[PDB]
From a paper:
CE clan proteases, specific hydrolases for ubiquitin-like modifications (SUMO and NEDD8) in eukaryotes, reportedly serve as bacterial effector proteins with deSUMOylase, deubiquitinase, or, even, acetyltransferase activities. Here, we characterize bacterial CE protease activities, revealing K63-linkage-specific deubiquitinases in human pathogens, such as Salmonella, Escherichia, and Shigella, as well as ubiquitin/ubiquitin-like cross-reactive enzymes in Chlamydia, Rickettsia, and Xanthomonas. Five crystal structures, including ubiquitin/ubiquitin-like complexes, explain substrate specificities and redefine relationships across the CE clan. A comparison to the previously determined SENP2-SUMO2 and NEDP1∼NEDD8 complexes (Reverter and Lima, 2004, Reverter et al., 2005, Shen et al., 2005) revealed differences among bacterial CE DUBs in three variable regions (VRs) near the substrate binding (S1) site that were arranged around a structurally conserved helix (constant region, CR).
Author numbering:
A (entry chain A): 317 to 515
B (entry chain B): 19 to 95
The structure:
Amino acid sequence: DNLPSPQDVADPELPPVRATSWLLDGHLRAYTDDLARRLRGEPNAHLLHFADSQVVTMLSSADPDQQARAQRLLAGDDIPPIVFLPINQPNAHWSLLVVDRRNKDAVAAYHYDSMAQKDPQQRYLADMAAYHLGLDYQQTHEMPIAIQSDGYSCGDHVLTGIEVLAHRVLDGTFDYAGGRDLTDIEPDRGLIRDRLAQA
Amino acid sequence: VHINLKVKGQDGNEVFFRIKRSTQMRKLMNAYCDRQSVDMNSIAFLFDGRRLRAEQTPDELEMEEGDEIDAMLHQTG
C-alpha cells in the first residue's frame, strides 16, 4: 500500500563521495555516527557528543519552537558535556566549534578554521552558534589547525579534527600541553570514503 | 489510527499533516517537497535530531500527537 513502486520516483539516497567532491551535511553525520559506534564502550567515550550540522543551524532559527528544540538537543540536561558543532557557510565552507561544558561555571569554546585567509563570515557563524547556546562569543578561542592547500577538503579537516580530538579525550591528553592543537593533522579523503562505505 | 504531525521548513511556516501511524514517511516527504518544488535529494528531514528515511513509520519512530519535524535544505562547503 505504501511500498515504493517502480513507476514512481525512487526513494532519496545520499550521493557517493568522490576524490575532490564537496562534503554534504549527510556525509558528516554518517561519519560521526560511525565514529560513535567505534568509540562505544571505551572509557570517557560517553563524555562526547557529535552534533548534526542541521541542528546547529537550527539554533539561529527565526522560529521560537525550532530554536528552543535545537537548544535542548545540544545543551539539555541529558547531553554529554563535550560537544562538537560543525559550522557550515552554505555553498562555501566548513569549520568546527568545540564546547567543553564539564565545568558549568567555566565553559571553554574552541574554533578551528582550515582556511588560509579567513572569511569574517565563518567566525560570525561560529559566534552566533555560541551565542544561542548561552555563551559569550568573545571568549571563544581561535585555535591552530592545519591549513588546507586546496579548495575542497574543508569538510575533511572538520571530520579529521573531530576524529583526533575525540581520541585525545579517550586517552586523556585533551586536557594537557598541546591537547587542543590540530596543527599536524593530515586529512585522508580515501580513509573518509572507506569509513562511509563500511558504515 | 491516525496521528497529526507538523513539518516546519526554513520559511518558518508550519505544514500540518494527518497520516496513519502505519504510513511510511515517503508519503509525507513527497507531499512536502512538491510544495517547495525541490526534490527529496535536496532536503533533509529530522525528528528530534534523528534523520528520517522513506520506509519508516510514525510507530517505529515513537512519534506522538502533535510532534514536529524539521525540514532543512542540504548544506555543502
